[PDB]
């Protein structure tokens, strides 16, 4: 897993759980959504409801204070988003929509309309109309040409053109169509519900060519100079041909997507078949199909894949990247299948982590830092933890389902509170498409409206985080690495706090300043350690350790892999305005960083207790580490403490990114959470303590943490906000 999980609820920093700004239009969202990039550089999403009734856009890098604007549509869609179309014309979003009663409607949204204050839309947004008889012959597909063309594609297999003469009105230009003429046969009928190959997928080629995929895997190409059918491919009969079952893709979805003049389609055979062959003048060429990796039944559905140019992978030999989307329920299944060579026989699938950190940490109970104790307490926790919008969803579905917190201190209502909460985000993320965020970052989008998930490359340490029992081989770093966590996985979360809390100590004084080291550790050792582990891991773990050549594994740990760059500045774009997107992908993707650092620097630290160590040799690095542990717990406390807060001190602590960055690639974005990082373990807990001045119960533990003159009056006035204060 070469990837890991960022998810971003755009709405997050803020209390209401809705834009204020939000218009209604009429016409005379948890079932589609995706993003489109438009003129001005902005992202605008779009949601198609459940019921394919409301279509919903709103500004992706400013989803509160920007306009959220749903249009609401007199009945349905004939066949959900398949019968739909947006693309940007000439500074319009033009949206086209073959309706269930037949009508055609046209919808012109101005550029400046979504981008604008405004409540009001004048002139002609919107046009009905009637082009042919959809009652006789259903259509099922819409796929967008030109501004002036479009094709329809029909259930019982025919294709319909549809030429805009003026700027309004459509006409039919059907196309030459003898498939039928198997009705011939005793095997088809052209009254029969089945025997349709009706299309399932479909791309333009060149401006001319128009690809199409059949629910009998045929490729057929037409050529919209002739309007002809120039090709028809059988995908099938090239591999092993299974007179068992070949399923007939009985719904339209996301089976082919083309780059340059390569092209790859998805065969059911297990549901794993990727055909890619290449395009050239029309005539296509098979080159391999490449299965896919999937287990436990294979019972995951394409989602949306997107065929594009090579990322930036632990291999040099790429040619080019699929990113595949599968789904099975509200789990998500993100892959990259590279290709090495023009070959399309050296490949290598790369796999993802399909959960985030935080959800991951929740569900293993490998979250050390949250703060344990009261019913109100663990409530701030999970409001804090999941944003607004899900908090207040799963009060709602509380309440309906009769469930109502009986007093203050009612610890079964919060059990369930735990569940549903886990749930409504888990719904809430169901995957939907993927964009390509910039030049390559790979997001998916979500049911819920304003919850994206960014799939971001792992750094070499994230890397080790998330491939523990897995990698084969690996550094002596690694190694050790793996080892540690081995050992420290044995023992519990009580103890494992209570070691943290005793580092914490050392820096605060509250373990004196007058002790050595190795009076600190032995203190450490019998509050928190001693009778807490099988000392047969102990062995275990000493034997292992003894293998490493510890001084040169910690300098790479310390000094290379774990303290970040000095930066001559390395172009991360600044932002002219706020970017509420990148703001939080920054924030939880620092805290994913900082979340594996702490729990690393907390299982060597833990080494260095155990074991005689010499405390004058490794003295540097033990006090960096101590240094390292304290930051890290800080800032992981003022991230569940208040994200908002934490994100604003965060990016007003660098000047000439104070309004926040730009990343259009996976090396911009990692090397600005490098930066941030820099900040952290480097003016900033001072801005921050004056910010928040101007998170009551944290800033205990960080005033007797952080505060270790200033600090004196510091620790009078948050005491104060009694007997210590005045006393200090």
Same mark, same amino acid.
């Given at each position: ?344 026989? &050296? ?211 310390? &000094? ?169």
């Amino acid at each position: 897993a070469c990837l890991s999980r960022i998810d971003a609820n755009l709405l997050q920093y803020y209390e209401k759980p809705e834009p204020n700004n939000t218009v209604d239009l009429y016409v005379s969202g948890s079932e589609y959504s995706n993003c489109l990039l438009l003129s001005n550089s902005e992202y605008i999403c779009y949601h198609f409801s459940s019921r394919s009734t409301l279509l919903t856009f709103y500004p992706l890098s400013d989803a509160y204070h920007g306009k959220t604007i749903n249009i609401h549509l007199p009945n349905a869609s004939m066949n959900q988003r398949y019968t739909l179309t947006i693309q940007e014309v000439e500074q319009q979003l033009l949206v086209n929509v073959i309706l269930k009663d037949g009508s055609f409607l046209t919808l012109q949204l101005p550029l400046s309309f979504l981008f604008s204050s405004a409540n009001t839309l004048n002139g002609e947004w919107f046009h009905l109309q009637n082009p042919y008889d959809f009652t006789v012959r259903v259509p099922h597909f819409l796929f967008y040409v030109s501004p002036q063309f479009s094709v329809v594609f029909l259930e019982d297999g025919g294709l319909l053109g549809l030429k805009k003469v003026d700027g309004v009105h459509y006409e039919p230009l059907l196309f030459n169509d003898n498939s039928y003429l198997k009705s011939l046969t005793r095997f088809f009928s052209r009254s029969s519900k089945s025997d349709y190959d009706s299309v399932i997928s479909c791309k333009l080629f060149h401006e001319r060519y128009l690809i199409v995929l059949t629910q009998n895997c045929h490729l057929k190409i037409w050529d919209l100079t002739s309007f002809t059918l120039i090709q028809d491919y059988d995908m099938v009969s090239q591999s092993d041909s299974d007179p068992s079952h070949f399923r007939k893709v009985e719904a339209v979805g996301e089976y082919l997507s083309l780059y340059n003049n390569t092209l790859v389609t998805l065969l059911p055979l297990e549901n794993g078949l990727f055909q890619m062959g290449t395009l050239l003048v029309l005539t296509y060429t098979f080159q391999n199909n490449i299965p896919t990796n999937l287990s436990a039944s294979a019972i995951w559905s394409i989602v949306d894949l997107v065929l594009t140019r090579p990322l930036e992978l632990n291999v040099e030999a790429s040619y080019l990247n699929l990113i595949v989307l599968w789904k099975s329920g509200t789990a998500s299944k993100l892959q990259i299948l590279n290709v090495n060579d023009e070959s399309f026989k &050296n490949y290598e699938w790369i796999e993802s982590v399909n959960k985030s950190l935080v959800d991951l940490q929740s569900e293993h109970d490998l979250d050390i830092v949250t703060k344990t104790g009261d019913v109100e307490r663990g409530f701030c926790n999970l409001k804090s933890r999941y944003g607004t919008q899900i908090f207040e969803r799963a009060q709602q579905i509380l309440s309906e389902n009769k469930i109502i917190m009986a007093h203050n201190e009612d610890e079964e209502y919060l059990a369930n509170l735990e569940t549903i909460l886990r749930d409504v985000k888990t719904a809430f993320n169901e995957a939907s498409s993927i964009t390509l965020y910039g030049d390559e970052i790979i997001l998916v989008n979500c049911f819920q409206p304003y919850n994206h998930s960014l799939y971001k490359l792992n750094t070499t340490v994230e890397n080790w985080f998330y491939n523990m029992h897995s990698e084969t081989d690996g550094s002596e770093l690694f190694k050790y690495l793996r080892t540690l966590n081995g050992f420290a996985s044995t023992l519990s979360n009580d103890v494992l706090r209570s070691i943290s809390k005793k580092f914490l100590d050392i820096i605060t004084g509250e373990l004196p300043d007058s002790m050595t080291t190795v009076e600190k550790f032995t203190d450490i050792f019998k509050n928190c350690l001693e009778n807490q582990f099988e000392i047969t891991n102990l062995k275990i773990l000493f034997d292992e350790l003894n293998s490493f050549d510890i001084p040169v594994v910690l300098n790479d740990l310390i &000094n290379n892999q774990m303290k970040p760059g000095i930066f001559w500045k390395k172009d991360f774009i600044s932002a002219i305005k706020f970017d509420g997107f990148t703001s939080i992908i920054s924030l939880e993707s620092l805290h994913q960083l900082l979340s594996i650092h702490y729990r690393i620097t907390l299982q060597v630290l833990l080494t260095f207790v155990l074991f005689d160590l010499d405390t004058e040799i490794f003295g540097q690095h033990i006090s960096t580490l101590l240094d390292l542990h304290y930051k890290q717990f800080l800032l992981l406390n003022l991230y569940r403490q208040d994200k908002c807060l934490l994100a604003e001190v965060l990016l007003k602590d660098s000047s000439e990114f104070s309004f926040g960055v730009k990343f259009f690639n996976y090396g911009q974005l990692i090397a600005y959470i490098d930066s941030l990082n820099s900040n952290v373990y480097n003016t900033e807990n001072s801005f921050f303590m004056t910010f928040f001045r101007s998170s009551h119960k944290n800033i205990r533990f960080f005033l007797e943490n952080v505060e270790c003159e200033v600090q004196e009056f510091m620790f009078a006035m948050t005491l104060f906000s009694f007997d210590q204060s005045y006393e200090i």
